[PDB]
Design an enzyme around this catalytic site. Structure first.
Site, short mmCIF file in Angstrom:
data_model
loop_
_atom_site.label_atom_id
_atom_site.label_comp_id
_atom_site.label_asym_id
_atom_site.label_seq_id
_atom_site.Cartn_x
_atom_site.Cartn_y
_atom_site.Cartn_z
N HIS A 77 -9.21 -4.07 -3.02
CA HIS A 77 -8.22 -3.30 -2.23
C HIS A 77 -8.62 -1.81 -2.27
O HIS A 77 -8.72 -1.18 -1.20
CB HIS A 77 -6.80 -3.63 -2.73
CG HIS A 77 -5.70 -2.90 -2.05
ND1 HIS A 77 -4.76 -3.53 -1.25
CD2 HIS A 77 -5.36 -1.59 -2.05
CE1 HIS A 77 -3.92 -2.65 -0.77
NE2 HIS A 77 -4.25 -1.45 -1.27
N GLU A 78 -8.92 -1.28 -3.44
CA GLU A 78 -9.23 0.16 -3.62
C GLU A 78 -10.56 0.48 -2.94
O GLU A 78 -10.67 1.55 -2.31
CB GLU A 78 -9.20 0.57 -5.10
CG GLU A 78 -7.79 0.61 -5.67
CD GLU A 78 -6.64 1.04 -4.74
OE1 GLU A 78 -6.72 2.17 -4.13
OE2 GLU A 78 -5.63 0.24 -4.63
N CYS A 88 0.86 -1.20 0.00
CA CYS A 88 0.00 0.00 0.00
C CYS A 88 0.89 1.25 0.00
O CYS A 88 1.79 1.36 0.89
CB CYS A 88 -0.94 -0.07 1.21
SG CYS A 88 -2.25 1.18 1.20
N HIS A 109 -10.60 0.93 0.79
CA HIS A 109 -10.11 2.28 1.18
C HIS A 109 -11.30 3.21 1.45
O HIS A 109 -11.14 4.09 2.35
CB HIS A 109 -9.18 2.87 0.11
CG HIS A 109 -7.76 2.51 0.34
ND1 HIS A 109 -7.16 2.71 1.58
CD2 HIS A 109 -6.83 1.96 -0.47
CE1 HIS A 109 -5.91 2.28 1.52
NE2 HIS A 109 -5.69 1.81 0.28
O1 LIG Z 1 -1.56 1.88 -2.26
C1 LIG Z 1 -2.52 1.43 -3.09
O2 LIG Z 1 -3.75 1.46 -2.80
C2 LIG Z 1 -2.04 0.87 -4.42
C3 LIG Z 1 -1.40 -0.51 -4.28
C4 LIG Z 1 -2.59 -1.47 -4.50
C5 LIG Z 1 -2.39 -2.96 -4.28
C6 LIG Z 1 -1.31 -3.53 -3.58
C7 LIG Z 1 -1.20 -4.90 -3.44
C8 LIG Z 1 -2.19 -5.71 -3.99
C9 LIG Z 1 -3.27 -5.17 -4.67
C10 LIG Z 1 -3.37 -3.80 -4.81
C11 LIG Z 1 -0.21 -0.56 -5.27
O3 LIG Z 1 -0.79 -0.58 -6.58
S1 LIG Z 1 1.00 -1.86 -5.02
C12 LIG Z 1 2.48 -1.61 -5.97
C13 LIG Z 1 2.71 -2.37 -7.29
C14 LIG Z 1 2.93 -1.66 -8.48
C15 LIG Z 1 3.17 -2.30 -9.70
C16 LIG Z 1 3.20 -3.68 -9.74
C17 LIG Z 1 2.99 -4.40 -8.57
C18 LIG Z 1 2.76 -3.76 -7.34
NI NI Z 2 -3.45 0.78 -0.14
#
Ligand SMILES: O=C(O)C[C@@H](Cc1ccccc1)[C@H](O)SCc1ccccc1
Ligand code: NI
Length: 183
Positions: A154-155, A111, A158
């Site tokens: 995940h989103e 995250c 939030h």
């Molecule tokens: O901080 C966020 O909400 C975005 C996260 C979302 C996420 C993390 C883990 C599993 C599912 C969703 C980031 O997109 S994670 C970073 C990332 C970027 C590119 C490729 C792989 C991981």
């Molecule tokens: Ni997150």
């Protein structure tokens, strides 16, 4: 242009609130912020720009993470080999159905708002249906499975003030659930 200094960190209270539904149509200002959220993900995924501006790579961003308590999300998942990619700016997204079968990233989750890693599997639904509005107030229904389902769930967490680590089993953090599919 958004950067890491725009992302609030775990402990910020806005991350634990319940984001508000948007009225349609969106304000100019709301459109601008949703385009910048997508633009952040695009920038974080370009190796030059991400290096020049110290961006962590992201595939998802919810408005609460830039401290705006509103129900909009951006998802950018690049083509991985499948020929399937996911480029979505969603207003008031809602999971309307889902599979009983669960799935998990075997590495656990990360995250942008969480500076440290937390070990542990985060079991989610393998398959979901989402109803949302697009930036222009038109209707979208998404049928998602596997990696994209996990990202969107995940989103949306939030928007309900839920954090990935809240799903992590306390005693058996790396114990896969019965018949859960590994992604
Ligand atoms: O901080 C966020 O909400 C975005 C996260 C979302 C996420 C993390 C883990 C599993 C599912 C969703 C980031 O997109 S994670 C970073 C990332 C970027 C590119 C490729 C792989 C991981
Ligand atoms: Ni997150």
């Amino acid at each position: 242009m958004l950067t890491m200094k725009d992302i609030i960190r775990d402990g910020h209270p806005t991350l634990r609130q319940k984001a508000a539904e948007l009225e349609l149509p969106l304000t100019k200002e709301e459109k601008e912020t949703l385009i910048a959220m997508r633009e952040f993900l695009v920038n974080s995924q370009d190796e030059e720009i991400a290096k020049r501006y110290g961006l962590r790579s992201g595939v998802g961003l919810a408005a609460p993470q830039i401290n705006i308590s509103k129900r909009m999300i951006a998802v950018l998942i690049p083509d991985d080999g499948s020929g399937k990619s996911y480029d979505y700016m969603l207003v008031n997204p809602k999971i309307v159905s889902h599979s009983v079968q669960e799935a998990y990233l075997p590495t656990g989750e990360g995250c942008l708002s969480v500076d440290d890693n937390v070990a542990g599997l985060v079991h989610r639904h393998n398959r979901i249906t989402i109803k949302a509005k697009d930036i222009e107030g038109n209707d979208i229904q998404l049928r998602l499975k596997g990696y994209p389902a996990i990202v969107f769930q995940h989103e949306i967490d939030h928007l309900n003030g839920v954090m990935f680590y809240d799903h992590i089993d306390k005693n058996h953090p790396l114990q896969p659930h019965t018949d859960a599919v590994e992604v």
